[PDB]
Each structure stands twice: as structure tokens, then as C-alpha cells.
Design a protein around this ligand. Sequence first.
Ligand code: HEC
Ligand code: HEC
Ligand code: HEC
Length: 71
Amino acid sequence: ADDIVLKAKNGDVKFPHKAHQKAVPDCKKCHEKGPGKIEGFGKEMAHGKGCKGCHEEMKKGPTKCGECHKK
Ligand code: HEC
Ligand code: HEC
Ligand code: HEC
């Protein structure tokens, strides 16, 4: 649905694929080739302009460790 768990060898990341909708009604923001899986995505990405990127972008959202990686 919206709740998506991103397996990580450094602590899984709980991503709410919902609140990120009303906050970013634009799905073309992340989904470039349309809704679906994202090819290439990864660490550098998540930390880059994948997750934090946006976060640190607006200074909103978890940008510190532990806030994403929960053991
Ligand atoms: C970035 C903040 C996103 C926005 C905006 C939207 N979605 Fe999304 N979606 C995102 C991720 C990170 C993922 C998983 C892939 C990954 O790289 O981790 C997804 C996945 C989907 C899927 C596939 C899951 C499934 O149902 O099988 C769909 C169908 C999907 N997303 C649809 C969708 C729609 C309709 C959105 C706007 C209403 C939308 N997404 C916004 C990240 C982001
Ligand atoms: C902008 C394009 C974003 C991208 C890309 C991602 N996130 Fe995000 N996130 C964003 C905002 C603006 C906020 C604050 C809430 C709001 O009003 O939109 C957040 C918040 C989170 C949170 C915590 C919010 C909560 O649950 O209360 C988490 C855990 C989070 N974001 C995770 C996350 C992940 C894992 C992403 C990559 C898959 C990701 N976000 C991308 C804006 C954006
Ligand atoms: C959410 C906004 C995150 C924050 C904050 C940080 N990281 Fe992260 N990291 C995130 C994701 C979504 C992923 C990949 C999970 C997936 O499968 O989608 C990662 C990955 C890592 C890794 C590599 C794990 C692996 O599987 O190889 C490392 C070593 C890592 N992250 C470290 C790390 C550090 C040091 C952080 C603070 C500076 C940090 N993460 C925050 C999402 C998020």
C-alpha cells in the first residue's frame, strides 16, 4: 500500500509511501518512468537525491542516521 520496508544491511528503513503523496502530489517527482520500481536506486541515491536529498533540500524530514535505519 504505502508502508514500504527498505531492507538494509545497516538497519531497514521504514518509508511511508503515503504522506509522501499529499506532501508531493506529484508522482513524476520521484517516478521518472512512471509509477513503479525505480531502477538504479540505492544508497548513494537514498542518501543523495533519493531520500535525504529532498529532506535536507527543504530541511524537512529525517536527515540524521538512526531516524531512517532502525535496528
Ligand atoms: C518519491 C517521494 C515518491 C513519490 C512522490 C511517489 N512515490 Fe511511488 N514509490 C516511491 C518509491 C521509493 C517506491 C519503491 C521503489 C524504490 O525505489 O524503493 C515507490 C513505489 C511505487 C509503486 C510500486 C509498488 C507497488 O504497488 O507494487 C507504485 C505503483 C507507486 N509507487 C505509485 C505512486 C503513485 C500513484 C504516486 C502518486 C499518487 C507515487 N507513487 C508517488 C517513491 C515515490
Ligand atoms: C521530497 C521529494 C522527498 C523525498 C524524495 C523523500 N521524502 Fe521523506 N519526507 C519529505 C517531507 C517533506 C517530509 C516531512 C513530512 C511532510 O510534511 O511531507 C518527509 C518525511 C519523512 C519521514 C518522517 C515523516 C513521518 O513519518 O512523520 C520519513 C521516515 C521519510 N520522509 C523517509 C523517506 C525515505 C525513506 C525516502 C526515500 C525512499 C524519502 N523520505 C524521500 C520529503 C521527501
Ligand atoms: C532515510 C531518510 C535515511 C537516512 C536519514 C539515512 N539513510 Fe542510510 N539508507 C537509506 C536507505 C533507504 C538505504 C537503502 C535501503 C534500500 O534497500 O532501499 C540506505 C542504505 C545505507 C547503507 C548501505 C546499506 C546496504 O544495504 O548496503 C549504509 C551504510 C547507510 N545507509 C548508512 C547511513 C548513514 C551513515 C547515515 C547517516 C549519515 C544514514 N544512512 C542515514 C535511507 C537513509
